[PDB]
Design an enzyme around this catalytic site. Sequence first.
Site, PDB file in Angstrom:
ATOM      1  CG  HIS A  53      -0.198  -0.104   2.535  1.00  0.00           C
ATOM      2  ND1 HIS A  53       0.565   0.924   3.049  1.00  0.00           N
ATOM      3  CD2 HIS A  53      -0.135  -1.109   3.440  1.00  0.00           C
ATOM      4  CE1 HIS A  53       1.065   0.558   4.215  1.00  0.00           C
ATOM      5  NE2 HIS A  53       0.656  -0.671   4.474  1.00  0.00           N
ATOM      6  CB  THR A  59      -1.104   2.181  13.420  1.00  0.00           C
ATOM      7  OG1 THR A  59      -0.143   2.173  14.483  1.00  0.00           O
ATOM      8  CG2 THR A  59      -0.531   1.464  12.197  1.00  0.00           C
ATOM      9  NE  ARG A 136      -1.844   0.110   6.621  1.00  0.00           N
ATOM     10  CZ  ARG A 136      -2.305  -0.002   7.870  1.00  0.00           C
ATOM     11  NH1 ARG A 136      -3.296   0.769   8.300  1.00  0.00           N
ATOM     12  NH2 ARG A 136      -1.775  -0.896   8.694  1.00  0.00           N
ATOM     13  CG  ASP A 182      -0.372  -9.725   6.529  1.00  0.00           C
ATOM     14  OD1 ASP A 182       0.867  -9.843   6.742  1.00  0.00           O
ATOM     15  OD2 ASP A 182      -1.144  -9.162   7.339  1.00  0.00           O
TER      16      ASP A 182
END
EC number: 3.1.3.-
Length: 434
Positions: A53, A59, A136, A182
């Site tokens: 991304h 965060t 995102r 992921d």
Amino acid sequence: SCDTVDQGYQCFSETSHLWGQYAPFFSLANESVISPEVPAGCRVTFAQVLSRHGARYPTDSKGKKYSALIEEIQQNATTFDGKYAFLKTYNYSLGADDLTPFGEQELVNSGIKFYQRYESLTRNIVPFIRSSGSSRVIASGKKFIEGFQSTKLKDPRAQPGQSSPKIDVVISEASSSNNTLDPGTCTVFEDSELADTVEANFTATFVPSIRQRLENDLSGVTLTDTEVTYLMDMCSFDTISTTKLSPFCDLFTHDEWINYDYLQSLKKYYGHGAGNPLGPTQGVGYANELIARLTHSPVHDDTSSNHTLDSSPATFPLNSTLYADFSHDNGIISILFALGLYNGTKPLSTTTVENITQTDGFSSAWTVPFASRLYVEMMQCQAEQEPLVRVLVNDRVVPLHGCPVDALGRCTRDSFVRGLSFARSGGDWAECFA
């Protein structure tokens, strides 16, 4: 003017390029020993891009800490002179978790570049796209599509009336989800604290001195080693949040940035790379999906892949020619290792900084900067009979391991697939539960 479609981010290079995975993408084309260009006499027959991304805000969790630390400094410090003057009235206004406007632009640029590089294919083939289920990442997928399609509309040789690409599959990031981009289901790996131990060991070798300098200059302030690294993190976020370099960058010298950059490489290497016993194992599912695409055959995997999702052409087509996947830095690191791309890299020293020559091209900034991209291309050339495979990482032609590479960094598809024995066997996935 210094962040371009082809070259990437070239502003403040002596500092911005030392931010590890918080560094904006910059092209390594000029650092490549082998020319990135498609050889004269060859024709690309397959192209896949795996992209991270774009640039994001901290965060929410970290933003809290950053904000708190800054207010705390603003309260405890008695003097703010010289390069610390800005701190007296700095107002923390960064957003959280989302892709930043700059990050959106990064993906649009990536889409433009992918289209142009493979024009002979992109002009009449719609890529099949997948994204991990994180806002995102999804937004990054959409910006890439924007750039890709916008270039296609301006192409005279492009096929009229063809449909636009879109996000065909969104893989859930729920803890119980099988996600090759992921993975989160490898129990033992998820509990690993190796990266924390390494981070602690190394920061000890250079942060303490920095901490003493800051405590001394901002009288009344006490800082832990970790908090100092938060201030270094701010240099990145406060700069690319919008022309001008963040004052937070000015508080550290160049050799300290060299160390910071190295700290980021360590975190990724021992967290998800070969430094972790189960690091490369996290990328075998994706690798087996890649083998499936190169050979146009069903997936044979029993690790992170979703069996249901990969059994049908609707969610896993074997004959599209162009594919694009969007993920996070962590998943990409594991995938890069599972593909055997950094086999000539010895375990990174946990006490001393090693340069890019010693690490054989590996660093967080060179593999997973914001909007990083990995290309896997297959080509057919006049002299050869079998198709040839080649991998570029952020524009650097990365020589393949496990197969006989030619002068241009390529391996025949068959020997390349044959060389991924670790992935084909399922890595050490078994160790995830025992």
